[PDB]
Structure 1
């Protein structure tokens, strides 16, 4: 349907998935923080201890831009990120 419309929607990577799973899994409040999600994110056996935190940082920055996720205050530290996916297109928009 037209040009740059009805697009691929490439499935996110295992860390970007873990960020979303973890945010919903313990999410019933006004925001889930970077440091919070990291705390039991690393409980997962395949999680790369040395870099994982940085991967989760890449994910959250991209998920917010995607409009998959949204920040309650979300500048640098604390941030707090609620999945804003609920009331949206869900299919992508420019």
Structure 2
């Protein structure tokens, strides 16, 4: 298997559609070829929690925990 910032790239990159990108449609695609452990959902929200704050991923619209994201940082 590959890492979870390896997995988060594959869903949003391949197709590009529902709610810009959001939490359910990412986890549906991700499970098909990561091969699911129980920790999948726990370390997929953690991967998002540190990727949104670093600059690799930037968020479109939300409040606190919920929302929707993109890949290209804002103004870049």
TM-score (norm 2): 0.76
CA deviation vs aligned residue, 1:31-50 (integer Å, no higher than 9, x gap): 200111001111115332x1
Change (3 A) 1:37 1:30: closer
2:44 equivalent in structure 1: 56
- Select 1:81's aligned residue among 63, 69, 74: 69
Please list, as runs of the form range in 1=range in 2, the aligned pairs for 1:8-87 lying within 5 A after superposition: 14-28=3-17, 31-48=20-37, 50-75=38-63, 76-77=65-66, 79-85=67-73
1:22–1:37 CA contact under 8 A, matched in 2: yes
Residue-pair matches, total: 74
Change (3 A) 1:45 1:58: closer
TM-score (norm 1): 0.64
1:27–1:82 CA contact under 8 A, matched in 2: no
Q: What stretches of structure 1 of length at least 5 have no aligned partner?
A: 1-12, 89-94
2:18–2:25 CA contact under 8 A, matched in 1: no
Of Structure 1 and Structure 2, the greater helix share is in 2
RMSD over equivalenced CA pairs, Å: 2.4
